[PDB]
Amino acid sequence: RVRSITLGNSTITTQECANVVVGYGVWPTYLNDDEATAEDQPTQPDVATCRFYTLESVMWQQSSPGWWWKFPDALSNMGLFGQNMQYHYLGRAGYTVHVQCNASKFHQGCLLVVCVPEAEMGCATLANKPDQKSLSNGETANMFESQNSTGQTAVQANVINAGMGVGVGNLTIFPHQWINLRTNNSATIVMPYINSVPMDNMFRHNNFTLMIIPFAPLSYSTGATTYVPITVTVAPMCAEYNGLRLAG
Amino acid sequence: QTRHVKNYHSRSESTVENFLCRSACVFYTTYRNHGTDGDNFGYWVISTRQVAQLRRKLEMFTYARFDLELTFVITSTQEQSTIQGQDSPVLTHQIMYVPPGGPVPTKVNSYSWQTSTNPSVFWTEGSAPPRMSIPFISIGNAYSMFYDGWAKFDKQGTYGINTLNNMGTLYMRHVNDGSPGPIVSTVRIYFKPKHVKTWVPRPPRLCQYQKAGNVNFEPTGVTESRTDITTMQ
Amino acid sequence: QTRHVKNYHSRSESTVENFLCRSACVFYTTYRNHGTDGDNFGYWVISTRQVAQLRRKLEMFTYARFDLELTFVITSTQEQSTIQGQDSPVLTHQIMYVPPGGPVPTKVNSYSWQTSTNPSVFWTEGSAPPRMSIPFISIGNAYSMFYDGWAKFDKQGTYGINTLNNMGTLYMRHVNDGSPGPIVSTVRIYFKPKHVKTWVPRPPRLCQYQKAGNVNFEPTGVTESRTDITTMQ
Amino acid sequence: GLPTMLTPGSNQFLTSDDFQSPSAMPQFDVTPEMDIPGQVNNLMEIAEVDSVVPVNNTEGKVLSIESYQIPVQSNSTNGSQVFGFPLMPGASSVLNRTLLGEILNYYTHWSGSIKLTFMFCGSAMATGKFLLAYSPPGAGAPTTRKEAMLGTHVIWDVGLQSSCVLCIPWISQTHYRTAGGYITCWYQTNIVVPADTQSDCKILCFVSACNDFSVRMLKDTPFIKQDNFYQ
Amino acid sequence: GLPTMLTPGSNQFLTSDDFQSPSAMPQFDVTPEMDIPGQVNNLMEIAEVDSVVPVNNTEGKVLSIESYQIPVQSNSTNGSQVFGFPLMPGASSVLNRTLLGEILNYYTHWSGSIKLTFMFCGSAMATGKFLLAYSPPGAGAPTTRKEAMLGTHVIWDVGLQSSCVLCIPWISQTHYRTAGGYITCWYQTNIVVPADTQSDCKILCFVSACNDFSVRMLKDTPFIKQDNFYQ
């Protein structure tokens, strides 16, 4: 049937028997004390942030290249967990990413829904670094391009290279899920916290980005809706922050 | 060529250790025995992003953790000059490893050469090439080959970069001039990762590299083109 | 820089052994193959109070007990001259350790060179650097880094000094001239304490050192100053 | 001391040597390993991952996403060829730059079985049949749908299943530095739709490595160039 | 003899080597060790000792004893700041030259918990309250007594106890060669005395190392200079 999932004061509905891609095989977990470690780096969990956050749906069209969000930044103004990023210096969390797609049986298209860790992106100008606005717009999706981007500090958003200088067709090496409208309409990726350090500043670094790239273009019969909404729902998992109390 | 042979399913050197623990030449520089203003010394900041082959092989992963086994091939050649009767004694070279955050030599006779916390190897020519090993020197848990962040958030040019991938700097100089004549030595540093751990594999780089400290790229085709999609004649 | 990382409580190299058993360059001198009046020889009285860094590290303690592992880096360079066709054979050097209270060479050919109780190492160039170890040579139970007393009570200038901290003197010379031309060699003595025991820790030195054989100091501020005691804006 | 002879090969630097080296910084405590997810021990793990194949390498398409999209014409001649490429994962440009192809181009010798997955990306109401034909090495590409039917082939029914998986047993490399096998698709039937769609259907291709690949002689990849120093 | 190869790195002098050396004076009997009190095996033992902090580093005071004395005004504005310094044991000049700071300046990397002890040195009849406020790294120094009260803080009652001990959990180093935390004091109340004393009360600060410091990369201290030979 249909399964309803509630986290805090938010509820979503998902079809049962829907595949869940669990990161690199690792479910998000809390940090573990190493043989009763001293209280020199106290950690503070937060369970109020474990709720669904629903970004504004992106309108998938016929000539529509991909979108991407950088989720440490994409949830930086979503009430809690954004206040938590602002208040705490060091943060650590995983995410459950739900990608819905509302289309009828008369719609066509395929989507690559991939979460790319450490997706450092190049600049349109070779001797430059892309700015914050182009790299991540927060809750607003940044869009890929069908041709080379132009700009002094703009991201090279041509979809063929996914902004990283690699083959876009080889993006499946990362935790991904294909959305074929004739077979699928949902994608669930559970991304564990991936970093070279146990905790890191969240304004200063993006753990991963989600790329939604239409490989097969959207198509429809005459009279059907010319666009298709793509909804991204995010539930932070196992959010930890540096303890603010005095050690003694 | 390469006729069909039996498949023995050898996965032996497809492992990350045999894939990356290859000794590659990453740097070579020249320095003279006599210098105009004490600048007759070679140096190389240890980076894995200057040679495009080793860089691509390492960037096929997101995080790495390895040791730095460095081998130096120092060869000295006598330059042409009018000085006669040189008769140079054997030449000794000093190779200093400055750890991350250590004193940096400015000239060939700076105090940073005669320090105590910078590992230095003194090698006399005619012996086996000098060899030193640097451990996993990062204070983080791994070397991040990619960094979707800034060193300082309020700085535009700090994107990427990180601060935990600093592996130190190498410094090379002549201990003795030998003769009152021109002698120039090449160091030809050879790099070899050891005990490699890698995480989060990544697609191989498709676009040619532009800068050593950038991921910036000119957009390129996903592959070479062909005349027809079908194999018809 | 140096982002927050996990604390693993490594006390490993905070120990006195890893703190002091570091090989540091304490002395370097030059001597010629030919001498005007037989004075073409180098010498160094073994003291731990000439290099201000090792001196500070050792003076962070009151009493110490260590071995003297000395390494010598001898490099010879041929000076410019009108002598032609030199063709110098390989050069041999003699490094003598005069124990406390032993005969003292006066010239390069003094009888104290060809003695029997002074340990001497003969090293030919082109080999590994010579190395000798001196035990804890004091007749007392430890080396006193500080001495609130006089060698002789009735003498003003004997304050401090002690008489049990004498570790001997090193003497360096050319065994053979090699060629009838000017050759000057640098010894570059490297010092490394071994098996260190330390007692009665002391505050680190705050005022810059003035003399090697004194504790005299120009009074200095306890620290650098700041504009305001409060962190107000 | 102990009498020894130095033996030929002493004091030499062979770059492919496994001798222990002296540590430049002993008595330094390295940070312990932390469990990062996604640890990789073998490049075959990357090779075994599905990668989208750019079958539509026609001129002007390799710079756009539609190089990966195989066009399926609604009004197409019966028995025509949809697509077809030589079955060379390292030589043919169709499979060359895929994950498996990139891994293979790092080694001189390799052999195994590739896994090809074709996904139909039309409407759920669309119905049709495709004939995926496999030609063994040396056989040559079929020229008609009947020759394809008389060889190794599968009837890919769009109406029943939207994905088809083919495992090819004889792959191997072809050179040290045709006659490799072919995979082709044919229009057994046409694509049938309830309503009029202006755009044509697309087919996505995926290539992957099976567990039986070997790689034996590492070499430099031919897809990166560095003709000058960066400093 | 036994065939051997010299191997790269032979005949080299690496200063950070642990090879056995030949004894220049063998067959000499060294004096046995005698039990001197105060044997030290680790520099953390010196680091863990309380050291007086010169909080009053205002100009003209670092050359006098009153740099260690925090002045406490009898007639001071309510809610004013008594003192405050950045919580950097190696960078800030307040904690820099203390025993813990001197030990830390010998190592590139360190992390642990510092112990701060404030001692009030007024008369036994004096009574007052102080608000010792701890700001975590990145939080910033509080500007009012209310912001200090809303964070981590202790109410130091002079009348009850003349000493206060604070353990700070997150210290660490800040550079290879702000945003480190702050500790501040505020006048919760004024100092009350029975009789008229002309001189003001003083507060002494002590810093110390807790058992959880590590030090990992020894280096030269930046507080000693030797630009020429002594002979």
Side-chain angles (χ1 to χ4, degrees):
Chain A
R1 309 175 183 181
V2 54
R3 176 206 183 189
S4 170
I5 300 168
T6 300
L7 294 174
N9 54 9
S10 55
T11 312
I12 68 165
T13 53
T14 52
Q15 321 179 107
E16 291 185 355
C17 205
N19 294 358
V20 175
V21 176
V22 180
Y24 286 87
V26 178
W27 201 267
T29 63
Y30 283 120
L31 273 178
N32 298 341
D33 286 356
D34 194 22
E35 199 263 328
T37 184
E39 195 190 3
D40 67 308
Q41 290 179 353
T43 311
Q44 180 201 117
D46 196 8
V47 307
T49 55
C50 189
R51 74 184 295 278
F52 295 118
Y53 294 112
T54 305
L55 315 173
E56 178 62 280
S57 294
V58 291
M59 297 291 108
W60 181 14
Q61 305 149 56
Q62 198 144 342
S63 73
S64 184
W67 310 260
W68 73 88
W69 302 255
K70 299 186 162 303
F71 284 103
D73 183 69
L75 295 180
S76 59
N77 190 359
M78 284 308 180
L80 267 168
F81 176 89
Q83 293 179 356
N84 275 0
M85 285 167 68
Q86 184 178 2
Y87 282 163
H88 297 269
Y89 200 40
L90 300 161
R92 181 191 195 279
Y95 311 85
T96 305
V97 182
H98 285 87
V99 173
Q100 306 307 321
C101 190
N102 286 292
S104 49
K105 323 193 90 180
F106 278 44
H107 280 86
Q108 309 183 354
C110 189
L111 285 163
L112 171 58
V113 180
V114 60
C115 288
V116 175
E118 294 294 328
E120 175 179 353
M121 302 196 152
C123 178
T125 306
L126 294 174
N128 268 338
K129 300 264 191 56
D131 53 352
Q132 273 86 341
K133 198 47 163 33
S134 303
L135 277 159
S136 177
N137 208 354
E139 54 165 343
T140 313
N142 272 335
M143 287 188 31
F144 282 114
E145 301 211 4
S146 299
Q147 83 268 20
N148 301 354
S149 313
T150 65
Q152 276 311 96
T153 61
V155 171
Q156 188 48 235
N158 203 339
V159 59
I160 46 167
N161 302 138
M164 294 182 286
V166 290
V168 65
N170 302 345
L171 275 186
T172 63
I173 190 59
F174 301 115
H176 76 281
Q177 180 84 88
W178 289 98
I179 294 190
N180 202 355
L181 294 193
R182 72 177 283 135
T183 298
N184 277 344
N185 53 58
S186 296
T188 304
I189 298 176
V190 181
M191 264 301 264
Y193 174 81
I194 300 178
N195 204 345
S196 57
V197 285
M199 293 177 71
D200 186 40
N201 192 243
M202 294 169 90
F203 286 161
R204 183 180 63 83
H205 175 237
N206 300 127
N207 314 134
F208 78 98
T209 196
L210 165 81
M211 287 182 206
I212 301 189
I213 292 162
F215 270 64
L218 179 80
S219 184
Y220 41 84
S221 288
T222 49
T225 305
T226 56
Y227 54 107
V228 165
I230 299 177
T231 296
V232 185
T233 295
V234 183
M237 296 176 72
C238 298
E240 293 179 353
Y241 305 97
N242 52 300
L244 303 175
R245 284 85 170 93
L246 203 61
Chain B
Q1 292 181 357
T2 306
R3 313 285 156 123
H4 276 264
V5 300
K6 183 175 174 66
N7 185 2
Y8 286 108
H9 318 285
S10 198
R11 293 181 184 271
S12 170
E13 79 168 6
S14 189
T15 63
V16 293
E17 176 80 38
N18 291 172
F19 179 64
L20 286 171
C21 183
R22 304 279 160 136
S23 189
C25 193
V26 290
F27 184 75
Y28 89 103
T29 193
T30 42
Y31 50 99
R32 275 69 174 174
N33 56 336
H34 312 293
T36 309
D37 197 5
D39 50 356
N40 47 309
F41 74 96
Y43 76 99
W44 174 59
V45 181
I46 304 179
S47 71
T48 69
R49 313 176 47 160
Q50 293 183 2
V51 169
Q53 288 268 355
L54 165 77
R55 175 175 184 184
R56 201 173 178 263
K57 281 160 66 176
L58 269 175
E59 293 208 333
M60 269 155 84
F61 314 96
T62 312
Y63 300 119
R65 185 190 175 96
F66 46 81
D67 291 331
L68 309 174
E69 193 206 68
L70 301 176
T71 303
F72 316 90
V73 185
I74 298 96
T75 78
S76 297
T77 176
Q78 176 213 29
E79 307 180 39
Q80 180 66 302
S81 74
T82 63
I83 295 91
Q84 297 279 129
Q86 295 186 359
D87 176 43
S88 169
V90 71
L91 284 186
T92 315
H93 304 262
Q94 168 178 1
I95 307 177
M96 197 163 36
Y97 171 68
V98 180
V104 176
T106 305
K107 298 293 183 182
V108 73
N109 52 340
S110 295
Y111 80 99
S112 296
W113 287 104
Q114 287 69 240
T115 179
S116 175
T117 54
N118 298 1
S120 182
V121 62
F122 289 83
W123 174 82
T124 312
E125 307 212 65
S127 305
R131 181 171 267 167
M132 65 171 69
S133 189
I134 297 89
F136 170 69
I137 210 74
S138 167
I139 62 165
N141 295 118
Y143 292 130
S144 82
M145 307 281 129
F146 287 91
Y147 191 70
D148 188 26
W150 301 261
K152 296 179 180 65
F153 185 33
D154 44 46
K155 298 293 183 182
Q156 295 297 289
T158 47
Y159 184 67
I161 302 299
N162 194 353
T163 58
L164 282 72
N165 283 4
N166 189 228
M167 294 155 187
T169 311
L170 286 166
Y171 282 89
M172 289 76 72
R173 83 172 165 168
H174 289 107
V175 178
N176 58 338
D177 297 355
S179 77
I183 277 157
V184 58
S185 285
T186 312
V187 63
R188 208 173 307 247
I189 302 170
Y190 266 77
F191 178 52
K192 185 177 180 180
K194 274 280 192 71
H195 306 121
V196 181
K197 298 291 180 68
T198 45
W199 301 268
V200 188
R202 293 182 80 92
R205 174 88 169 193
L206 171 81
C207 315
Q208 296 302 323
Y209 293 110
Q210 318 286 343
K211 280 73 176 175
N214 277 328
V215 297
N216 297 4
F217 56 95
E218 191 54 38
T220 61
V222 296
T223 189
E224 313 295 328
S225 68
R226 57 164 166 161
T227 60
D228 291 331
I229 183 169
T230 68
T231 177
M232 289 299 287
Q233 206 89 357
Chain C
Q1 292 181 357
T2 306
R3 313 285 156 123
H4 276 264
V5 300
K6 183 175 174 66
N7 185 2
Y8 286 108
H9 318 285
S10 198
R11 293 181 184 271
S12 170
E13 79 168 6
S14 189
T15 63
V16 293
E17 176 80 38
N18 291 172
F19 179 64
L20 286 171
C21 183
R22 304 279 160 136
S23 189
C25 193
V26 290
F27 184 75
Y28 89 103
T29 193
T30 42
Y31 50 99
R32 275 69 174 174
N33 56 336
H34 312 293
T36 309
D37 197 5
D39 50 356
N40 47 309
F41 74 96
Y43 76 99
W44 174 59
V45 181
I46 304 179
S47 71
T48 69
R49 313 176 47 160
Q50 293 183 2
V51 169
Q53 288 268 355
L54 165 77
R55 175 175 184 184
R56 201 173 178 263
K57 281 160 66 176
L58 269 175
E59 293 208 333
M60 269 155 84
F61 314 96
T62 312
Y63 300 119
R65 185 190 175 96
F66 46 81
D67 291 331
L68 309 174
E69 193 206 68
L70 301 176
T71 303
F72 316 90
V73 185
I74 298 96
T75 78
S76 297
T77 176
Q78 176 213 29
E79 307 180 39
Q80 180 66 302
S81 74
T82 63
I83 295 91
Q84 297 279 129
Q86 295 186 359
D87 176 43
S88 169
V90 71
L91 284 186
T92 315
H93 304 262
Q94 168 178 1
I95 307 177
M96 197 163 36
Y97 171 68
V98 180
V104 176
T106 305
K107 298 293 183 182
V108 73
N109 52 340
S110 295
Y111 80 99
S112 296
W113 287 104
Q114 287 69 240
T115 179
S116 175
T117 54
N118 298 1
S120 182
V121 62
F122 289 83
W123 174 82
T124 312
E125 307 212 65
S127 305
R131 181 171 267 167
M132 65 171 69
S133 189
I134 297 89
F136 170 69
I137 210 74
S138 167
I139 62 165
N141 295 118
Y143 292 130
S144 82
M145 307 281 129
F146 287 91
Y147 191 70
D148 188 26
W150 301 261
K152 296 179 180 65
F153 185 33
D154 44 46
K155 298 293 183 182
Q156 295 297 289
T158 47
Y159 184 67
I161 302 299
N162 194 353
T163 58
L164 282 72
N165 283 4
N166 189 228
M167 294 155 187
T169 311
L170 286 166
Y171 282 89
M172 289 76 72
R173 83 172 165 168
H174 289 107
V175 178
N176 58 338
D177 297 355
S179 77
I183 277 157
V184 58
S185 285
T186 312
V187 63
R188 208 173 307 247
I189 302 170
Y190 266 77
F191 178 52
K192 185 177 180 180
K194 274 280 192 71
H195 306 121
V196 181
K197 298 291 180 68
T198 45
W199 301 268
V200 188
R202 293 182 80 92
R205 174 88 169 193
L206 171 81
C207 315
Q208 296 302 323
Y209 293 110
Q210 318 286 343
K211 280 73 176 175
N214 277 328
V215 297
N216 297 4
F217 56 95
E218 191 54 38
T220 61
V222 296
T223 189
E224 313 295 328
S225 68
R226 57 164 166 161
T227 60
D228 291 331
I229 183 169
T230 68
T231 177
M232 289 299 287
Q233 206 89 357
Chain D
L2 273 300
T4 60
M5 294 182 286
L6 276 191
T7 286
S10 83
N11 278 331
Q12 90 176 19
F13 169 44
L14 170 66
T15 63
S16 57
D17 72 315
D18 211 12
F19 292 137
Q20 183 66 41
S21 53
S23 193
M25 293 177 71
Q27 65 183 357
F28 166 77
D29 191 74
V30 298
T31 62
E33 295 194 0
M34 167 213 57
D35 189 358
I36 313 175
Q39 166 146 17
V40 62
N41 305 89
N42 195 333
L43 277 296
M44 295 298 102
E45 293 179 353
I46 306 148
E48 292 164 335
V49 164
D50 279 343
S51 185
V52 194
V53 179
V55 192
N56 193 11
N57 312 128
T58 55
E59 313 288 324
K61 305 280 182 183
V62 295
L63 289 167
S64 62
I65 196 73
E66 65 183 1
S67 64
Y68 301 96
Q69 311 165 359
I70 294 141
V72 179
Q73 264 63 57
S74 199
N75 53 3
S76 188
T77 318
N78 189 359
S80 289
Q81 190 154 187
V82 191
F83 62 86
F85 48 96
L87 212 49
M88 294 182 286
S92 66
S93 60
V94 188
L95 304 166
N96 189 359
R97 304 308 303 258
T98 59
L99 280 177
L100 161 69
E102 301 292 45
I103 299 293
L104 292 180
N105 279 304
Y106 268 117
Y107 291 88
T108 307
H109 301 113
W110 43 268
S111 48
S113 302
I114 65 164
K115 182 175 73 175
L116 275 178
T117 304
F118 308 96
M119 177 198 309
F120 185 73
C121 305
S123 60
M125 294 299 291
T127 314
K129 278 172 145 90
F130 292 108
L131 196 151
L132 276 299
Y134 161 58
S135 293
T143 57
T144 61
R145 195 215 39 97
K146 185 179 176 180
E147 304 175 46
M149 176 285 282
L150 294 173
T152 308
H153 73 120
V154 297
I155 297 296
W156 178 20
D157 208 322
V158 175
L160 287 192
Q161 65 183 357
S162 45
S163 171
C164 204
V165 180
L166 270 74
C167 288
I168 313 296
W170 282 87
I171 293 303
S172 186
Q173 198 182 309
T174 61
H175 302 101
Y176 272 91
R177 184 167 176 82
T178 181
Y182 287 83
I183 185 69
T184 64
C185 186
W186 303 87
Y187 287 110
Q188 178 57 48
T189 64
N190 50 300
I191 291 297
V192 185
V193 290
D196 194 309
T197 187
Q198 72 276 16
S199 199
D200 58 331
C201 307
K202 296 295 193 292
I203 284 177
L204 291 181
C205 194
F206 311 89
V207 72
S208 176
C210 290
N211 51 6
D212 55 356
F213 291 97
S214 65
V215 288
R216 292 177 69 189
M217 207 184 251
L218 185 79
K219 65 176 177 67
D220 287 17
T221 191
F223 305 139
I224 193 66
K225 295 156 303 182
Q226 182 197 2
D227 56 350
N228 47 5
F229 267 81
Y230 279 142
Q231 203 173 24
Chain E
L2 273 300
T4 60
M5 294 182 286
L6 276 191
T7 286
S10 83
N11 278 331
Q12 90 176 19
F13 169 44
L14 170 66
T15 63
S16 57
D17 72 315
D18 211 12
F19 292 137
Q20 183 66 41
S21 53
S23 193
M25 293 177 71
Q27 65 183 357
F28 166 77
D29 191 74
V30 298
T31 62
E33 295 194 0
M34 167 213 57
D35 189 358
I36 313 175
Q39 166 146 17
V40 62
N41 305 89
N42 195 333
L43 277 296
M44 295 298 102
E45 293 179 353
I46 306 148
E48 292 164 335
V49 164
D50 279 343
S51 185
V52 194
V53 179
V55 192
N56 193 11
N57 312 128
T58 55
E59 313 288 324
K61 305 280 182 183
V62 295
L63 289 167
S64 62
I65 196 73
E66 65 183 1
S67 64
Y68 301 96
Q69 311 165 359
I70 294 141
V72 179
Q73 264 63 57
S74 199
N75 53 3
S76 188
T77 318
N78 189 359
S80 289
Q81 190 154 187
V82 191
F83 62 86
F85 48 96
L87 212 49
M88 294 182 286
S92 66
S93 60
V94 188
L95 304 166
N96 189 359
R97 304 308 303 258
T98 59
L99 280 177
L100 161 69
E102 301 292 45
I103 299 293
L104 292 180
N105 279 304
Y106 268 117
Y107 291 88
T108 307
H109 301 113
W110 43 268
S111 48
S113 302
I114 65 164
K115 182 175 73 175
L116 275 178
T117 304
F118 308 96
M119 177 198 309
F120 185 73
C121 305
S123 60
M125 294 299 291
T127 314
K129 278 172 145 90
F130 292 108
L131 196 151
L132 276 299
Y134 161 58
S135 293
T143 57
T144 61
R145 195 215 39 97
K146 185 179 176 180
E147 304 175 46
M149 176 285 282
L150 294 173
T152 308
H153 73 120
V154 297
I155 297 296
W156 178 20
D157 208 322
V158 175
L160 287 192
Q161 65 183 357
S162 45
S163 171
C164 204
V165 180
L166 270 74
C167 288
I168 313 296
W170 282 87
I171 293 303
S172 186
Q173 198 182 309
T174 61
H175 302 101
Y176 272 91
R177 184 167 176 82
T178 181
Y182 287 83
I183 185 69
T184 64
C185 186
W186 303 87
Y187 287 110
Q188 178 57 48
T189 64
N190 50 300
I191 291 297
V192 185
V193 290
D196 194 309
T197 187
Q198 72 276 16
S199 199
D200 58 331
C201 307
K202 296 295 193 292
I203 284 177
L204 291 181
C205 194
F206 311 89
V207 72
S208 176
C210 290
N211 51 6
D212 55 356
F213 291 97
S214 65
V215 288
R216 292 177 69 189
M217 207 184 251
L218 185 79
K219 65 176 177 67
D220 287 17
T221 191
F223 305 139
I224 193 66
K225 295 156 303 182
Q226 182 197 2
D227 56 350
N228 47 5
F229 267 81
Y230 279 142
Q231 203 173 24

